[PDB]
């Protein structure tokens, strides 16, 4: 029959559960000068964590995957918010001067991470047409609101305890309740994935080979470098915005130096409550202009996705010499290109479904999102430290000259931001014929 309350808290508990994943994901980020000032480190080694842990999840997403794919499914899940959680409770006990540890820390955290977005979501497709599509709707949304709070929780358990070191204590608690009911909720161990009718196989494929086709699709490159592209530039400035902020505060000479107050905490929850906010006006304003444009052209989705990119690279190129004077004009900056660069995340899977065949589908949700790691934000944040200490070198130690160079390095992100704009016209160019190519195809194999 029909589980009564079973189908509706699995997805309760595992949405809490992603909201906590990306919590604990961004609550290292958003206390990074307490980091900073604690370790002695410059910037490469603040950007260090996140690219570690960037390049660990990477790594780790694919075995997970396999792993899932045919072992048991929810003790792999419990295990590994019991890993992470654990990981993230025992790095806060560091001292000063094994900063290399703390590192290593993240790489394991980036491996639990990596266990629950790849096999989460999955268990959902287990359970549930239109109720499907609304929880997956739920539980996609569920990542604003928890990049929000890790870093509303952050700012405010720094400000509060006056120490930065129960930042990181306090997160993985509802971790170590909420996986329990994840053993104990959860209906049933593992179903579907029962494709193989007949005998114990149906359609294995070969993997390589449908691949050798993909990169002939023209469309489907250049929107997936598109989205290697947005990556970087959303991994660099929401690693590096607040420390921004905080600098540009402190050489306007509005509030006093760290350590003195518990330094920069509004700007971190202000930061917080916009990029909430944005997630959900960004995906409402993209839906609606796709919406509003298909009924006038084919080439909808590209098109606004190239428009939506070039808006939101002239509101960050706007934002960087607006901070100088004053920090309204920059929220409101940071609120334009926040909306302007998020308006393109569903579009960017739906034209990925709307080009390529459904059998080499999964294959490709894979293949790209390898790649939307591998340009992006696997060492954005240590290339803007690198670039950061290298002007830095060559100059006089002064906070203004700390802000002007952080600033001059964050003026990477439009260049790349007006390439992948670049790119989405290229997909724009020939995404009619290449959908009328896989139209052909697929209407001509049955
Ligand atoms: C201007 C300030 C910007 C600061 C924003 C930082 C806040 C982070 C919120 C978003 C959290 C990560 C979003 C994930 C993006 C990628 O996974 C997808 N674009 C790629 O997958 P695919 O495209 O294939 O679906």
């Not at 370790?39 to 790594?59: N, W, Y």
């Not at 606004?304 to 004053?326: D, E, H, P, Q």
């Not at 790691?373 to 060492?379: P, R, S």
Request: proline share 3%.
């Amino acid at each position: 029959a029909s589980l009564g309350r079973g189908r509706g808290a699995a997805a309760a508990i595992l949405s809490l559960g992603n909201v906590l994943n990306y919590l604990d994901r961004y609550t290292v980020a958003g206390v990074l000068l307490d980091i900073q000032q604690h370790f002695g480190v410059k910037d490469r080694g603040a950007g260090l964590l996140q690219s570690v842990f960037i390049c660990s999840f990477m790594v780790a997403a694919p075995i997970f995957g396999y792993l899932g794919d045919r072992f048991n499914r929810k003790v792999i899940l419990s295990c590994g918010i019991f890993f992470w959680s654990a990981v993230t409770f025992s790095s806060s006990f560091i001292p000063q001067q094994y900063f290399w540890l703390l590192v290593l820390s993240r790489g394991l955290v980036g491996i639990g991470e990596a266990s629950y977005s790849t096999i989460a979501p999955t268990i959902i497709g287990d359970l549930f047409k239109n109720t499907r599509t609304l929880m997956l709707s739920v539980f996609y949304f569920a990542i604003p609101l928890g990049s929000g709070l890790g870093y509303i929780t952050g700012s405010s358990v720094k400000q509060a305890a006056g120490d930065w070191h129960w930042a990181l204590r306090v997160s993985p608690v509802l971790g170590m309740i909420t996986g329990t009911l994840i053993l104990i909720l959860v209906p049933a161990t593992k179903r579907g994935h029962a494709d193989q009718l007949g005998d114990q196989l149906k359609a294995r494929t070969s993997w390589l080979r449908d691949m050798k086709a993909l990169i002939r699709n023209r469309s489907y490159v250049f929107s997936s470098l598109a989205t290697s592209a947005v990556s970087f530039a959303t991994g660099a400035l929401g690693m590096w915005i607040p420390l921004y902020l905080h600098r540009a505060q402190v050489v306007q000479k509005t509030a006093e130096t760290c350590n003195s107050p518990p330094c920069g905490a509004k700007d971190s929850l202000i930061f917080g409550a916009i990029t909430c906010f944005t997630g959900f006006l960004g995906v409402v304003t993209g839906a609606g202009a796709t919406r509003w444009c298909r009924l006038k052209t084919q080439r909808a989705d590209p098109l606004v996705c190239a428009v939506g990119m070039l808006g939101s690279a002239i509101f960050i190129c706007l934002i960087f010499v607006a901070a100088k004077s004053s920090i309204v004009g920059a929220y409101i900056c940071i609120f334009v290109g926040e909306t302007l660069l998020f308006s393109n995340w569903a579009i960017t899977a739906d034209i990925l479904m709307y080009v390529v065949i459904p059998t080499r589908r999964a294959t490709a949700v894979a293949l790209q999102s390898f790649t939307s790691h591998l340009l992006g934000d696997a060492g954005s944040p240590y290339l803007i430290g690198f670039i950061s200490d290298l002007i830095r070198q060559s100059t006089k130690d002064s906070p203004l000259w700390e802000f002007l160079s952080l600033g001059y390095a964050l003026m990477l992100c439009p260049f790349v931001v007006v390439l992948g704009g670049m790119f989405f016209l290229a997909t724009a160019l020939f995404f009619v014929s290449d959908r009328a190519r896989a139209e052909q195809q697929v209407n001509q194999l049955a």
